[PDB]
Write a protein that binds this ligand. Structure first.
Ligand SMILES: *[C@@H]1O[C@H](CO[C@@H]2O[C@@H](C)[C@@H](O)[C@@H](O)[C@@H]2O)[C@@H](O[C@@H]2O[C@H](CO)[C@@H](O[C@H]3O[C@H](CO[C@H]4O[C@H](CO)[C@@H](O)[C@H](O)[C@@H]4O)[C@@H](O)[C@H](O[C@H]4O[C@H](CO)[C@@H](O)[C@H](O)[C@@H]4O)[C@@H]3O)[C@H](O)[C@H]2NC(C)=O)[C@H](O)[C@H]1NC(C)=O
Ligand SMILES: *[C@@H]1O[C@H](CO[C@@H]2O[C@@H](C)[C@@H](O)[C@@H](O)[C@@H]2O)[C@@H](O[C@@H]2O[C@H](CO)[C@@H](O[C@H]3O[C@H](CO[C@H]4O[C@H](CO)[C@@H](O)[C@H](O)[C@@H]4O)[C@@H](O)[C@H](O[C@H]4O[C@H](CO)[C@@H](O)[C@H](O)[C@@H]4O)[C@@H]3O)[C@H](O)[C@H]2NC(C)=O)[C@H](O)[C@H]1NC(C)=O
Ligand code: HEM
Ligand code: HEM
Ligand code: HEM
Ligand code: HEM
Ligand code: HEM
Ligand code: HEM
Ligand code: HEM
Ligand code: HEM
Ligand code: HEM
Ligand code: HEM
Ligand SMILES: [Ca+2]
Ligand SMILES: [Ca+2]
Ligand SMILES: [Ca+2]
Lengths: 149, 146, 144, 150, 144, 146, 146, 149, 150, 144
């Protein structure tokens, strides 16, 4: 239902657009995908096994890259729809139905993904704002990972 | 065709026309209003996402999902591997829907009309037509986009 | 600390932003060298052929344009070690006969940083990232 | 609702605060500082002892005063840091460890001095917003009581 | 000259004005320390625990916030010797074990002044008043 | 006191300060933020309407109900009969709540400060103080508003 | 009541509403136009300062003197000694005028309505009512302001 | 009648408002009262005796403080009414009737008060303007002290 | 009227002056400088002697010129200081003592060179305001002739 | 290089522009001396009679007004050697008893230049012309 105040979503959507958009060379996307997962894994390696189909065996495979991109692409759609609770609520329900109807996904894993992002992004974004993001990002996590044991 | 030069281009024109934040929702609503006017029938193919009303959060979310996808796909135009891996991943998600490839042609014209009408006169219609045939062939597989 | 992958992206941008595109460039340059020669007026004896005595003349601005123009080439490649080294190298064979002290490759590093911060604002400037990656570019011109 | 300290809440608290608390008005500070503690004590009696090294029993002692002003001036530094959260975190945890090496200091201690403020502010600061203020006063203490017993 | 009664009022204000209220503060701080460590880079060896190597990091800005936050406490009391000393004192017992040279309590004094002038403008800045009263605050942390 | 002249007046000043549409919700939020700051304690008397958060629709609706009532009451200041009939109807609704009449004094100051601060310098403080004592006496009955 | 907290407050709200320069003359003219409308009669008590016409420099100067005083008095709310010394000094200046303390009540409402209507909705009516009773008791002495 | 040009009164009224208004802590008022009189006296001690009623014996008495405040409060009303010659002329006539109907007050005393203010204020006000003040303050002095032997 | 040099008078004089007197126009200065003294002398004959160390008799002497420009450039510095009176006072008295160590220099000397300007300015400077100019030319000389005989 | 005819015209203007006309002057001055005494705090011992300890006081600003006021007189004459020398001279007999080292007539030269550039912008500032002609004015006060 309710995610983050408007001025918040604003700070988040701006910083995010600074480092994530279709105008960015595939070379950076890759670097972000890896960074984010090579950090997720070092936090919860027990989760690395969930990415078989996407060839997690090799994180440098056109197969796995596409997966990190569609993950980050989904997190792209949420941040950019923060100002529309209506649609955002549905978009995050739809994402839960999937991450849940999938086996072995523990909610604590997302929490791991949260801390990863919180730590990773500030290395890419100028004057990254931890608070605005926390108020906007947390609702997203819990909304997406609503049902994960 | 759709050589890397045009791929890097379609990426810029897109990123520009698509915008961020509210821009995205708005751009998508125009693209889909274009699709359902180009092909009224195409609409009934989306009853499951409340296509009865385009303003319903059910359908706005669908728009968010699709052109949200279009965004990611186009974002990889410069990485054959990834682009193809994910362009394939979509084919499997769309294959079972048993969709007439003719709509993918409409999605092409809808897309063009919206990016072009949003980006201004310097819209590269050719570059766009070509590099989109790549996405359609990757999704539909129909030799209509060859 | 280390010029990792993340730090190279944030630097590519911050630079491109501060290096401008051809307007505040003549000012970017003038700001860096008018810092180099203040912390090391000794250095100007190396730019004798490009009028290092008066950093206001065309001849010299053309020089600084040539220098910062190179710094770009490099930053532009911090995300491509192969073609990167191949340039840092092509640059090493060019500053050997010029007898440049590594101490100097560090006074210019700072000046550049004082200017990029100047252009994009301290509130966002990332030193550990700028100090890290800049070093990598100089420890390549020095032939390593 | 969410209860999060939103950017708007921040701009508002920062403003309301700025007017009432500044080096411009020596005396404006003292008056508020004492008021707060004086409100805590009469609500949490066995709390005066926590401030013995600073004459917690003598509200007017030149020592407790210098104290009262320090604590509130501490909040000031924080409120002003709501504008730069990365820094406010480093600053709110340095204050966390620093409040652990003290005894009988509890998450419940703050919750009291919190009601302390909610009843004191509205008397000196005009245009007080209990709801917004609270969401951000809490945002600050949750970073202080990080490592603490209830 | 002397930090009289009048001079303490004009300082309380000029400071409060320049110390801002929470917006241009991160800049106030950054401006003072980026002056301290330029006139005395030696000093940064004391702020090892608060990352004195890069005054751009949060950890350090948090430090400067702690310092300038204290300077306030004091200025806020230049018009109350009783509760004032009681703080300058409570501060003396805190900078003893840190082995700070009175010479340093004078490089920071100047930096602060270079920043307050920077914020409120030289046209109005009152040195004899700022030099006078600032001394009083330092000759109290030094235990006198 | 509170003769008809002042009643017709308090009606105009009110109608003006209260406004319509969003104005109303906004005016009420200021009046209640005034009440809970004049008397922090007064707040706990409204736990049943989610007074934990003033922005919750539960409480915004309460504000809408009360000053919504204040509006109707004041609107009848010129009809003793109706005014008294409804002023009585409220006494019965409030009697069982067992409310200290002292808060009704705060509601008085809150009200004044909000109408006066909204209507501008020409606020008739006396007329308002008098004619509100009429509403309080009618609701509370306490001889504190005599 | 009128504890120091409210005293420091009434000082800020006042200093703000009173303004400086022309603001002062203007604020005072509104306060006195409020007094003479709250109590028409109160006017004849000022014939000596040309209260026949409020725009006459004779009366504008009176306004300047009185609320000019109000300003100083309120400015000392945080120093019992001085405040009382000067609050006393006024009692002697006003005692012989043989003034009904009832007008001091009007000056209270006039004052409130003007500061509140100038300062906006956040006017602290209670704090103001209390701390003004202090000034009235100090000047009039009547146990009406206790 | 005529005091100072408008732009002048302006500079004066602004600087004055910077250091004198009801929002200032009683602690500063006091410091100003003393400063101004401890400077008036050192210039004309023969005048110190005029302040008996106000307990000049002790300059730290709630009695004397109130007096400096109502003096400075009167000088507050003049500076703030500089743009209204009409009322200001009357306000200063009224103040003369009093300082004259009072015994022992020599005009040279006010001149002393003038020099005191001119010297004292610049220690409180930023970029104090001696000229603007002189053009505005002198008329006030002479207008107030019109009749003092 | 008051005769005081008001802030408006200042902005006006400063402007009218600025256009006619600047390092941009060498020659614009000389022309004015000489003109003034040349007007003084023919009105106050026994005044040439006061400027003997600078060839007061030879209006074109490279020495008197360097003089004329110095005196007027002195006025310039002052006029520009009307913007910062605190400083202008320190500067007008340093000029006062400095004009006392000279002989036959009188308050009446200035009053002449004052008419000197009032008849010269209006010929080169457009939009001259004798009244405003005068109120401020005088404001400056009253600080110069501080310690001087009529 | 040489302070030719052309260079004297471009300097007359650039100066007149930066010396303003009476508004940003108090700032011009303050900017130059707050550079002189930073590169040579030693020098302030010569301006003891004009409060060289605090360049914020009236007494001193009045001094700087007197100095820069003179610099004008001279620049105003770079296009008139006759009446020019006659002033540079009248100035030489005034700085003799003050024991000024020619090294100092070069620290002020630079400060002035740092200020004129500051006022009119580096993009247009002409050093070789400002360094050239300024020298000529000092090598005249030094009696040559
Ligand atoms: C992680 O998985 C990747 C798998 O690679 C990715 O996924 C695959 C399914 C493909 O779609 C790939 O496109 C994609 O990168 C493993 O790394 C890849 O392995 C291939 C080897 O097949 C690397 O390709 C190198 O070799 C090709 C072809 O080399 C042959 O042909 C050339 C003529 O073009 C001859 O000159 C050679 O002698 C050889 O016979 C070649 O294009 C590249 O080599 C050239 O260019 C280099 C410059 O980068 C030069 O240094 C060489 O001297 C030469 O001129 C390729 O290096 C392919 O690059 C990698 N991909 C990556 C990311 O490097 C990877 O091993 C696995 N991780 C592990 C170790 O477990
Ligand atoms: C100039 O005149 C003033 C007159 O004082 C002023 O005018 C009077 C009419 C009153 O209205 C005063 O409020 C006003 O200040 C002379 O100075 C004042 O003199 C009084 C003495 O009566 C000072 O008061 C001190 O003492 C009081 C009460 O002390 C007694 O009670 C306390 C308990 O509260 C006991 O602990 C004591 O043992 C004693 O029996 C007290 O409140 C203060 O002392 C405490 O606080 C101090 C901190 O500031 C501590 O240092 C002490 O240890 C103690 O705890 C007062 O200091 C009153 O302060 C002064 N006023 C001023 C400005 O200081 C003044 O002497 C005369 N000038 C001369 C010398 O000719
Ligand atoms: C909030 C951050 C996250 C977002 C936005 C996100 C988004 C997505 C999306 C869009 C898909 C693709 C669904 C499709 O194929 O159509 C996906 C798949 C998946 N996600 Fe996430 N995800 C997030 C976090 C996680 C986490 C923390 C885990 C667990 C460790 C996880 C595990 C998976 C798995 C196992 C798949 C299926 C991969 C496959 O098809 O082979 N995700 N996610
Ligand atoms: C290249 C352009 C297109 C892209 C990128 C795209 C992408 C997507 C995505 C990402 C989904 C949903 C994935 C999920 O449930 O998580 C989807 C669903 C769907 N798409 Fe497309 N699509 C495209 C074109 C089309 C066209 C032309 C049609 C045909 C009319 C179509 C029909 C559908 C339908 C019927 C669904 C299922 C919706 C539902 O019930 O959830 N798509 N598409
Ligand atoms: C940031 C790293 C540096 C880069 C990228 C760089 C780049 C360049 C380039 C591209 C040229 C001229 C090429 C040509 O047109 O022939 C050049 C010339 C030169 N550089 Fe550097 N340089 C760097 C650092 C330095 C340093 C630290 C010094 C020493 C003080 C230095 C001294 C010189 C000299 C003396 C020349 C010759 C100028 C001339 O041709 O007259 N460079 N540099
Ligand atoms: C969130 C609001 C609070 C802030 C901003 C705050 C701030 C501070 C500061 C700045 C100090 C002194 C640091 C120094 O000496 O350098 C301090 C000390 C202290 N605080 Fe707090 N504090 C807060 C709440 C509390 C609470 C709720 C308690 C609990 C009872 C508490 C107990 C103490 C104690 C016991 C000391 C040590 C005093 C001494 O040195 O004698 N504080 N606090
Ligand atoms: C203007 C006067 C100064 C004031 C008001 C002041 C205030 C403070 C405060 C409040 C703290 C930290 C308290 C805590 O949270 O534990 C502190 C720490 C410190 N100060 Fe100062 N200080 C001043 C001058 C200096 C100077 C001149 C130096 C020396 C170069 C200095 C060096 C330090 C160091 C090394 C620390 C410890 C930082 C740490 O905890 O890692 N201070 N100062
Ligand atoms: C003259 C001013 C007032 C008016 C016109 C007024 C009117 C009303 C109305 C219309 C209702 C609800 C009727 C319904 O449920 O349909 C109500 C409820 C209530 N009022 Fe008042 N009221 C006034 C003053 C007060 C005051 C001063 C208090 C005391 C603190 C108070 C406390 C309450 C409470 C506790 C409820 C019950 C809320 C609930 O749980 O639903 N009212 N009032
Ligand atoms: C607290 C509020 C009030 C203050 C601060 C105040 C202050 C003053 C002052 C300063 C004067 C003149 C002193 C002088 O002549 O130098 C004055 C005069 C006077 N006041 Fe008040 N006054 C207040 C309220 C009132 C009220 C309520 C009345 C009654 C209607 C009143 C009636 C008068 C009268 C009749 C004079 C004499 C005017 C004359 O003929 O000169 N004042 N007051
Ligand atoms: C221009 C500056 C001055 C102003 C604005 C001023 C103003 C005032 C005012 C408002 C009063 C109070 C009248 C009353 O009680 O209602 C007063 C009283 C008085 N003033 Fe002044 N005054 C000034 C200068 C002086 C000077 C220079 C002296 C002489 C040394 C002086 C001596 C007195 C005396 C003796 C009283 C009577 C005190 C008493 O009632 O015990 N004043 N002045
Ligand atoms: C208010 C306008 C005047 C200004 C701004 C002014 C300025 C100056 C200046 C700047 C100097 C030279 C200082 C130096 O050598 O460093 C000077 C010198 C002198 N002035 Fe004036 N002056 C003024 C009016 C007068 C008047 C009215 C007389 C009277 C006859 C006068 C007589 C002199 C003399 C005799 C010298 C010395 C000339 C010499 O060195 O040979 N000045 N004046
Ligand atoms: C740019 C060239 C310079 C010019 C045009 C110049 C001009 C002047 C003038 C006009 C005066 C005061 C005349 C008076 O009113 O009596 C003066 C005084 C002085 N100058 Fe210079 N000056 C220059 C360079 C310097 C330098 C480089 C120094 C040395 C650090 C210096 C040191 C002094 C001192 C110590 C005084 C005396 C101040 C006093 O009277 O207290 N001047 N200069
Ligand atoms: Ca290095
Ligand atoms: Ca010192
Ligand atoms: Ca030289």
């Amino acid at each position: 239902s309710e995610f983050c105040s408007e001025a918040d979503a604003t700070i988040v959507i701006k910083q995010w657009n600074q480092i994530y958009n279709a105008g960015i060379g595939a070379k950076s996307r890759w670097t972000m995908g890896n960074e984010i997962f090579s950090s997720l894994f070092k936090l919860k390696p027990e989760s690395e096994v969930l990415f078989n189909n996407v060839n997690v065996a090799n994180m440098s495979s056109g197969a796995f890259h596409a997966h990190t991109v569609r993950v980050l692409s989904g997190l792209d759609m949420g941040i950019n729809y923060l100002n529309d609770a209506g649609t955002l609520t549905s978009l995050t329900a739809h994402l839960a139905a999937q991450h849940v109807a999938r086996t072995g996904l523990k909610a604590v894993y997302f929490d791991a993904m949260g801390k990863v992002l919180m730590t990773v992004l500030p290395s890419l974004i100028d004057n990254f704002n931890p608070d605005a993001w926390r108020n906007c990002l947390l609702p997203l996590k819990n909304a997406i990972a609503k049902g994960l044991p | 065709d759709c050589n890397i030069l045009q791929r890097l281009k379609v990426k810029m024109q897109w990123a520009k026309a698509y915008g961020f934040g509210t821009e995205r929702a708005k751009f998508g609503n125009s693209l889909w209003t274009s699709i359902f006017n180009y092909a009224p029938d195409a609409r009934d193919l989306f009853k499951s996402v409340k296509s009865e009303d385009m303003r319903s959060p059910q359908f706005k979310a669908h728009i968010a999902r699709v052109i949200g996808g279009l965004d990611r796909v186009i974002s990889m135009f410069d990485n054959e591997d990834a682009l193809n891996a994910d362009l394939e991943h979509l084919k499997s998600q769309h294959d079972p829907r048993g969709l007439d490839a003719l709509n993918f042609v409409v999605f092409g014209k809808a897309l063009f009309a919206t990016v072009g009408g949003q980006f201004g006169v310097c819209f590269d219609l050719p570059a766009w037509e070509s590099c989109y045939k790549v996405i359609a062939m990757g999704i539909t597989g129909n030799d209509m986009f060859s | 600390s280390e010029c990792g992958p993340l730090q190279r992206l944030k630097v590519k941008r911050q630079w491109a932003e501060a290096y401008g595109s051809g307007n505040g460039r003549e000012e970017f340059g003038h700001f860096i060298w008018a810092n180099v020669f203040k912390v090391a007026p000794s250095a100007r004896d190396m730019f004798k052929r490009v009028r290092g005595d008066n950093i206001y003349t065309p001849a010299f601005r053309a020089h600084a344009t040539r220098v910062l123009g190179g710094l770009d080439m490099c930053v532009a490649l911090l995300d491509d070690e192969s073609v990167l080294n191949t340039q840092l190298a092509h640059l090493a064979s060019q500053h050997s006969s010029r007898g440049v002290s590594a101490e100097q490759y560090n006074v210019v590093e700072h000046a550049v940083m004082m200017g990029v911060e100047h252009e994009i604002g301290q509130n966002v400037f990332d030193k550990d990232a700028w100090q890290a990656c800049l070093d990598v570019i100089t420890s390549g011109i020095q032939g390593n | 609702s969410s209860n999060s300290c939103t950017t708007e809440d921040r701009r508002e608290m920062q403003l309301m605060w700025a007017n009432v608390w500044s080096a411009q008005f020596t005396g404006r500070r003292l008056a508020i500082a004492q008021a707060v503690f004086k409100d805590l004590f009469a609500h949490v009696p066995d709390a005066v002892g926590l401030f013995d090294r600073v004459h917690g029993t003598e509200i007017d002692s030149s020592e407790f005063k210098a104290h009262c002003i320090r604590v509130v001036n501490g909040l000031d530094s924080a409120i002003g840091l709501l504008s730069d959260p990365s820094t406010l975190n480093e600053q709110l945890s340095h204050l966390a460890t620093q409040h652990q090496e003290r005894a009988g200091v509890t998450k419940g201690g703050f919750s009291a001095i919190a009601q302390s403020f909610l009843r004191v502010m509205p008397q000196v600061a005009s245009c007080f917003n209990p709801d917004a203020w609270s969401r951000c006063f809490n945002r600050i203490t949750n970073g202080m009581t990080e490592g603490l017993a209830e």
